[PDB]
PDB file of all heavy atoms in Angstrom:
ATOM      1  N   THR C   1     113.694  99.611 121.143  1.00  0.00           N
ATOM      2  CA  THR C   1     113.074  99.485 122.466  1.00  0.00           C
ATOM      3  C   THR C   1     113.354 100.710 123.282  1.00  0.00           C
ATOM      4  O   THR C   1     114.117 101.559 122.847  1.00  0.00           O
ATOM      5  CB  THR C   1     113.697  98.255 123.192  1.00  0.00           C
ATOM      6  OG1 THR C   1     115.108  98.444 123.299  1.00  0.00           O
ATOM      7  CG2 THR C   1     113.410  96.931 122.490  1.00  0.00           C
ATOM      8  N   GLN C   2     112.763 100.792 124.477  1.00  0.00           N
ATOM      9  CA  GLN C   2     113.041 101.834 125.476  1.00  0.00           C
ATOM     10  C   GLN C   2     112.707 103.241 125.109  1.00  0.00           C
ATOM     11  O   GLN C   2     113.341 104.162 125.637  1.00  0.00           O
ATOM     12  CB  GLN C   2     114.506 101.740 125.994  1.00  0.00           C
ATOM     13  CG  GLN C   2     114.895 100.399 126.588  1.00  0.00           C
ATOM     14  CD  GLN C   2     113.958  99.951 127.674  1.00  0.00           C
ATOM     15  OE1 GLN C   2     113.414  98.839 127.613  1.00  0.00           O
ATOM     16  NE2 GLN C   2     113.716 100.822 128.668  1.00  0.00           N
ATOM     17  N   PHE C   3     111.696 103.430 124.222  1.00  0.00           N
ATOM     18  CA  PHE C   3     111.312 104.747 123.790  1.00  0.00           C
ATOM     19  C   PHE C   3     109.963 105.205 124.267  1.00  0.00           C
ATOM     20  O   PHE C   3     109.082 104.396 124.537  1.00  0.00           O
ATOM     21  CB  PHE C   3     111.459 104.900 122.277  1.00  0.00           C
ATOM     22  CG  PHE C   3     110.588 104.015 121.431  1.00  0.00           C
ATOM     23  CD1 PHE C   3     109.355 104.466 120.959  1.00  0.00           C
ATOM     24  CD2 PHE C   3     111.034 102.764 121.020  1.00  0.00           C
ATOM     25  CE1 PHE C   3     108.603 103.692 120.074  1.00  0.00           C
ATOM     26  CE2 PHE C   3     110.252 101.971 120.165  1.00  0.00           C
ATOM     27  CZ  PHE C   3     109.060 102.451 119.680  1.00  0.00           C
ATOM     28  N   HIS C   4     109.805 106.528 124.331  1.00  0.00           N
ATOM     29  CA  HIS C   4     108.612 107.246 124.746  1.00  0.00           C
ATOM     30  C   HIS C   4     108.818 108.686 124.322  1.00  0.00           C
ATOM     31  O   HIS C   4     109.879 109.218 124.614  1.00  0.00           O
ATOM     32  CB  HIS C   4     108.403 107.141 126.269  1.00  0.00           C
ATOM     33  CG  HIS C   4     106.961 107.134 126.659  1.00  0.00           C
ATOM     34  ND1 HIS C   4     106.159 108.231 126.439  1.00  0.00           N
ATOM     35  CD2 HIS C   4     106.230 106.164 127.265  1.00  0.00           C
ATOM     36  CE1 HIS C   4     104.967 107.900 126.889  1.00  0.00           C
ATOM     37  NE2 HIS C   4     104.949 106.653 127.369  1.00  0.00           N
ATOM     38  N   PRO C   5     107.878 109.354 123.593  1.00  0.00           N
ATOM     39  CA  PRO C   5     106.542 108.911 123.168  1.00  0.00           C
ATOM     40  C   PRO C   5     106.527 107.770 122.126  1.00  0.00           C
ATOM     41  O   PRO C   5     107.580 107.452 121.564  1.00  0.00           O
ATOM     42  CB  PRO C   5     105.896 110.222 122.679  1.00  0.00           C
ATOM     43  CG  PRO C   5     107.046 110.984 122.123  1.00  0.00           C
ATOM     44  CD  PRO C   5     108.133 110.734 123.149  1.00  0.00           C
ATOM     45  N   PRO C   6     105.361 107.134 121.864  1.00  0.00           N
ATOM     46  CA  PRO C   6     105.340 105.987 120.946  1.00  0.00           C
ATOM     47  C   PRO C   6     105.571 106.352 119.486  1.00  0.00           C
ATOM     48  O   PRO C   6     105.956 105.475 118.706  1.00  0.00           O
ATOM     49  CB  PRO C   6     103.943 105.378 121.170  1.00  0.00           C
ATOM     50  CG  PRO C   6     103.124 106.493 121.636  1.00  0.00           C
ATOM     51  CD  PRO C   6     104.033 107.335 122.482  1.00  0.00           C
ATOM     52  N   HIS C   7     105.368 107.631 119.116  1.00  0.00           N
ATOM     53  CA  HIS C   7     105.615 108.054 117.749  1.00  0.00           C
ATOM     54  C   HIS C   7     107.097 107.878 117.437  1.00  0.00           C
ATOM     55  O   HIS C   7     107.946 108.441 118.131  1.00  0.00           O
ATOM     56  CB  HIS C   7     105.223 109.500 117.501  1.00  0.00           C
ATOM     57  CG  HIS C   7     105.439 109.885 116.073  1.00  0.00           C
ATOM     58  ND1 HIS C   7     106.582 110.554 115.676  1.00  0.00           N
ATOM     59  CD2 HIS C   7     104.704 109.587 114.978  1.00  0.00           C
ATOM     60  CE1 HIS C   7     106.483 110.693 114.360  1.00  0.00           C
ATOM     61  NE2 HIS C   7     105.377 110.120 113.891  1.00  0.00           N
ATOM     62  N   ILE C   8     107.386 107.090 116.399  1.00  0.00           N
ATOM     63  CA  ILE C   8     108.733 106.797 115.923  1.00  0.00           C
ATOM     64  C   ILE C   8     108.695 106.646 114.397  1.00  0.00           C
ATOM     65  O   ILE C   8     107.653 106.281 113.849  1.00  0.00           O
ATOM     66  CB  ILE C   8     109.316 105.546 116.643  1.00  0.00           C
ATOM     67  CG1 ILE C   8     110.860 105.516 116.558  1.00  0.00           C
ATOM     68  CG2 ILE C   8     108.632 104.199 116.215  1.00  0.00           C
ATOM     69  CD1 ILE C   8     111.546 104.767 117.647  1.00  0.00           C
ATOM     70  N   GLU C   9     109.831 106.929 113.723  1.00  0.00           N
ATOM     71  CA  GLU C   9     109.979 106.752 112.284  1.00  0.00           C
ATOM     72  C   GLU C   9     111.202 105.857 112.097  1.00  0.00           C
ATOM     73  O   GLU C   9     112.288 106.193 112.561  1.00  0.00           O
ATOM     74  CB  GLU C   9     110.130 108.100 111.548  1.00  0.00           C
ATOM     75  CG  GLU C   9     108.912 109.007 111.674  1.00  0.00           C
ATOM     76  CD  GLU C   9     109.000 110.321 110.924  1.00  0.00           C
ATOM     77  OE1 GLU C   9     109.319 110.301 109.713  1.00  0.00           O
ATOM     78  OE2 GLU C   9     108.722 111.373 111.542  1.00  0.00           O
ATOM     79  N   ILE C  10     110.999 104.686 111.481  1.00  0.00           N
ATOM     80  CA  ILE C  10     112.040 103.684 111.271  1.00  0.00           C
ATOM     81  C   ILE C  10     112.244 103.464 109.796  1.00  0.00           C
ATOM     82  O   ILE C  10     111.303 103.165 109.069  1.00  0.00           O
ATOM     83  CB  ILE C  10     111.701 102.357 112.008  1.00  0.00           C
ATOM     84  CG1 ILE C  10     111.529 102.599 113.511  1.00  0.00           C
ATOM     85  CG2 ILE C  10     112.768 101.303 111.723  1.00  0.00           C
ATOM     86  CD1 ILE C  10     110.826 101.525 114.271  1.00  0.00           C
ATOM     87  N   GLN C  11     113.476 103.606 109.366  1.00  0.00           N
ATOM     88  CA  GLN C  11     113.882 103.382 107.992  1.00  0.00           C
ATOM     89  C   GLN C  11     114.959 102.305 107.983  1.00  0.00           C
ATOM     90  O   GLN C  11     115.846 102.335 108.831  1.00  0.00           O
ATOM     91  CB  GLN C  11     114.493 104.674 107.394  1.00  0.00           C
ATOM     92  CG  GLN C  11     113.493 105.801 107.155  1.00  0.00           C
ATOM     93  CD  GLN C  11     114.190 107.062 106.704  1.00  0.00           C
ATOM     94  OE1 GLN C  11     114.887 107.090 105.687  1.00  0.00           O
ATOM     95  NE2 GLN C  11     114.037 108.135 107.465  1.00  0.00           N
ATOM     96  N   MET C  12     114.918 101.396 107.009  1.00  0.00           N
ATOM     97  CA  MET C  12     115.991 100.428 106.813  1.00  0.00           C
ATOM     98  C   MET C  12     116.668 100.823 105.497  1.00  0.00           C
ATOM     99  O   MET C  12     115.978 101.159 104.528  1.00  0.00           O
ATOM    100  CB  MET C  12     115.492  98.991 106.847  1.00  0.00           C
ATOM    101  CG  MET C  12     114.927  98.614 108.212  1.00  0.00           C
ATOM    102  SD  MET C  12     114.587  96.861 108.405  1.00  0.00           S
ATOM    103  CE  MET C  12     116.179  96.288 108.862  1.00  0.00           C
ATOM    104  N   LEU C  13     118.017 100.893 105.506  1.00  0.00           N
ATOM    105  CA  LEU C  13     118.826 101.367 104.379  1.00  0.00           C
ATOM    106  C   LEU C  13     119.748 100.317 103.777  1.00  0.00           C
ATOM    107  O   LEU C  13     120.445  99.603 104.509  1.00  0.00           O
ATOM    108  CB  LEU C  13     119.647 102.597 104.807  1.00  0.00           C
ATOM    109  CG  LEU C  13     118.895 103.692 105.582  1.00  0.00           C
ATOM    110  CD1 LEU C  13     119.839 104.516 106.417  1.00  0.00           C
ATOM    111  CD2 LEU C  13     118.131 104.606 104.630  1.00  0.00           C
ATOM    112  N   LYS C  14     119.779 100.240 102.437  1.00  0.00           N
ATOM    113  CA  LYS C  14     120.684  99.329 101.746  1.00  0.00           C
ATOM    114  C   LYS C  14     121.674 100.167 100.935  1.00  0.00           C
ATOM    115  O   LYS C  14     121.273 100.837  99.978  1.00  0.00           O
ATOM    116  CB  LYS C  14     119.945  98.283 100.891  1.00  0.00           C
ATOM    117  CG  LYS C  14     120.931  97.387 100.130  1.00  0.00           C
ATOM    118  CD  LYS C  14     120.284  96.693  98.963  1.00  0.00           C
ATOM    119  CE  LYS C  14     121.188  95.589  98.492  1.00  0.00           C
ATOM    120  NZ  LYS C  14     120.666  94.934  97.266  1.00  0.00           N
ATOM    121  N   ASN C  15     122.973 100.147 101.349  1.00  0.00           N
ATOM    122  CA  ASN C  15     124.040 100.961 100.732  1.00  0.00           C
ATOM    123  C   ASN C  15     123.645 102.463 100.708  1.00  0.00           C
ATOM    124  O   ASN C  15     123.787 103.147  99.686  1.00  0.00           O
ATOM    125  CB  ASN C  15     124.438 100.446  99.334  1.00  0.00           C
ATOM    126  CG  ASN C  15     124.850  99.007  99.291  1.00  0.00           C
ATOM    127  OD1 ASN C  15     125.571  98.511 100.161  1.00  0.00           O
ATOM    128  ND2 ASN C  15     124.460  98.325  98.234  1.00  0.00           N
ATOM    129  N   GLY C  16     123.102 102.925 101.840  1.00  0.00           N
ATOM    130  CA  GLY C  16     122.693 104.308 102.046  1.00  0.00           C
ATOM    131  C   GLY C  16     121.359 104.714 101.443  1.00  0.00           C
ATOM    132  O   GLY C  16     120.973 105.885 101.569  1.00  0.00           O
ATOM    133  N   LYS C  17     120.651 103.767 100.776  1.00  0.00           N
ATOM    134  CA  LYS C  17     119.359 104.051 100.128  1.00  0.00           C
ATOM    135  C   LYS C  17     118.250 103.359 100.842  1.00  0.00           C
ATOM    136  O   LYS C  17     118.408 102.226 101.271  1.00  0.00           O
ATOM    137  CB  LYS C  17     119.315 103.644  98.631  1.00  0.00           C
ATOM    138  CG  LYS C  17     120.577 103.848  97.827  1.00  0.00           C
ATOM    139  CD  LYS C  17     120.797 105.295  97.369  1.00  0.00           C
ATOM    140  CE  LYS C  17     122.210 105.495  96.887  1.00  0.00           C
ATOM    141  NZ  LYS C  17     123.226 105.039  97.889  1.00  0.00           N
ATOM    142  N   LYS C  18     117.098 104.011 100.913  1.00  0.00           N
ATOM    143  CA  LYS C  18     115.909 103.494 101.573  1.00  0.00           C
ATOM    144  C   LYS C  18     115.384 102.192 100.957  1.00  0.00           C
ATOM    145  O   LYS C  18     115.229 102.092  99.746  1.00  0.00           O
ATOM    146  CB  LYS C  18     114.817 104.585 101.587  1.00  0.00           C
ATOM    147  CG  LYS C  18     113.561 104.249 102.375  1.00  0.00           C
ATOM    148  CD  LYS C  18     113.823 103.979 103.838  1.00  0.00           C
ATOM    149  CE  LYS C  18     112.600 103.367 104.486  1.00  0.00           C
ATOM    150  NZ  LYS C  18     112.864 101.999 104.992  1.00  0.00           N
ATOM    151  N   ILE C  19     115.103 101.205 101.816  1.00  0.00           N
ATOM    152  CA  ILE C  19     114.511  99.921 101.425  1.00  0.00           C
ATOM    153  C   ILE C  19     112.984 100.134 101.415  1.00  0.00           C
ATOM    154  O   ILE C  19     112.417 100.576 102.428  1.00  0.00           O
ATOM    155  CB  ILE C  19     114.942  98.757 102.366  1.00  0.00           C
ATOM    156  CG1 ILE C  19     116.445  98.484 102.233  1.00  0.00           C
ATOM    157  CG2 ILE C  19     114.124  97.490 102.076  1.00  0.00           C
ATOM    158  CD1 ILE C  19     117.135  97.668 103.406  1.00  0.00           C
ATOM    159  N   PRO C  20     112.303  99.841 100.280  1.00  0.00           N
ATOM    160  CA  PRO C  20     110.852 100.078 100.213  1.00  0.00           C
ATOM    161  C   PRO C  20     109.983  99.128 101.057  1.00  0.00           C
ATOM    162  O   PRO C  20     109.182  99.613 101.864  1.00  0.00           O
ATOM    163  CB  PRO C  20     110.543 100.036  98.700  1.00  0.00           C
ATOM    164  CG  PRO C  20     111.843  99.982  98.014  1.00  0.00           C
ATOM    165  CD  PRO C  20     112.807  99.347  98.986  1.00  0.00           C
ATOM    166  N   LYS C  21     110.141  97.794 100.902  1.00  0.00           N
ATOM    167  CA  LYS C  21     109.315  96.829 101.644  1.00  0.00           C
ATOM    168  C   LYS C  21     109.834  96.506 103.061  1.00  0.00           C
ATOM    169  O   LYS C  21     110.564  95.519 103.269  1.00  0.00           O
ATOM    170  CB  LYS C  21     109.010  95.571 100.806  1.00  0.00           C
ATOM    171  CG  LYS C  21     107.542  95.163 100.849  1.00  0.00           C
ATOM    172  CD  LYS C  21     107.251  93.953  99.969  1.00  0.00           C
ATOM    173  CE  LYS C  21     107.261  92.651 100.737  1.00  0.00           C
ATOM    174  NZ  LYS C  21     106.887  91.501  99.871  1.00  0.00           N
ATOM    175  N   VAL C  22     109.485  97.385 104.021  1.00  0.00           N
ATOM    176  CA  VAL C  22     109.880  97.229 105.423  1.00  0.00           C
ATOM    177  C   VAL C  22     108.587  96.962 106.218  1.00  0.00           C
ATOM    178  O   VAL C  22     107.679  97.802 106.252  1.00  0.00           O
ATOM    179  CB  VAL C  22     110.699  98.436 105.974  1.00  0.00           C
ATOM    180  CG1 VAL C  22     110.861  98.345 107.496  1.00  0.00           C
ATOM    181  CG2 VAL C  22     112.060  98.539 105.295  1.00  0.00           C
ATOM    182  N   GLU C  23     108.483  95.762 106.781  1.00  0.00           N
ATOM    183  CA  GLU C  23     107.340  95.348 107.571  1.00  0.00           C
ATOM    184  C   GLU C  23     107.535  95.822 108.998  1.00  0.00           C
ATOM    185  O   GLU C  23     108.664  95.833 109.487  1.00  0.00           O
ATOM    186  CB  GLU C  23     107.203  93.815 107.534  1.00  0.00           C
ATOM    187  CG  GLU C  23     106.544  93.269 106.271  1.00  0.00           C
ATOM    188  CD  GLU C  23     105.033  93.397 106.211  1.00  0.00           C
ATOM    189  OE1 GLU C  23     104.357  93.035 107.203  1.00  0.00           O
ATOM    190  OE2 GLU C  23     104.522  93.829 105.152  1.00  0.00           O
ATOM    191  N   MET C  24     106.443  96.203 109.676  1.00  0.00           N
ATOM    192  CA  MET C  24     106.513  96.668 111.062  1.00  0.00           C
ATOM    193  C   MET C  24     105.615  95.823 111.960  1.00  0.00           C
ATOM    194  O   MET C  24     104.516  95.450 111.548  1.00  0.00           O
ATOM    195  CB  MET C  24     106.096  98.145 111.164  1.00  0.00           C
ATOM    196  CG  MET C  24     107.042  99.104 110.462  1.00  0.00           C
ATOM    197  SD  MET C  24     108.383  99.676 111.530  1.00  0.00           S
ATOM    198  CE  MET C  24     107.654 101.146 112.194  1.00  0.00           C
ATOM    199  N   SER C  25     106.063  95.553 113.204  1.00  0.00           N
ATOM    200  CA  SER C  25     105.239  94.824 114.153  1.00  0.00           C
ATOM    201  C   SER C  25     104.239  95.843 114.699  1.00  0.00           C
ATOM    202  O   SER C  25     104.389  97.059 114.492  1.00  0.00           O
ATOM    203  CB  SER C  25     106.073  94.227 115.289  1.00  0.00           C
ATOM    204  OG  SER C  25     106.460  95.185 116.261  1.00  0.00           O
TER     205      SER C  25
END
């Protein structure tokens, strides 16, 4: 929350590795 500009990159990590199936609202 609380961000501007709207462009953002969100990654979810499992034991330091990228999680492939990450759903976004």
Side-chain angles (χ1 to χ4, degrees):
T1 59
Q2 303 306 126
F3 63 94
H4 212 295
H7 182 262
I8 201 154
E9 297 182 51
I10 302 163
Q11 290 174 58
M12 296 190 84
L13 314 156
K14 177 199 194 185
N15 305 318
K17 323 280 166 308
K18 186 60 192 117
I19 294 162
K21 227 178 96 176
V22 170
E23 280 282 312
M24 294 271 268
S25 77

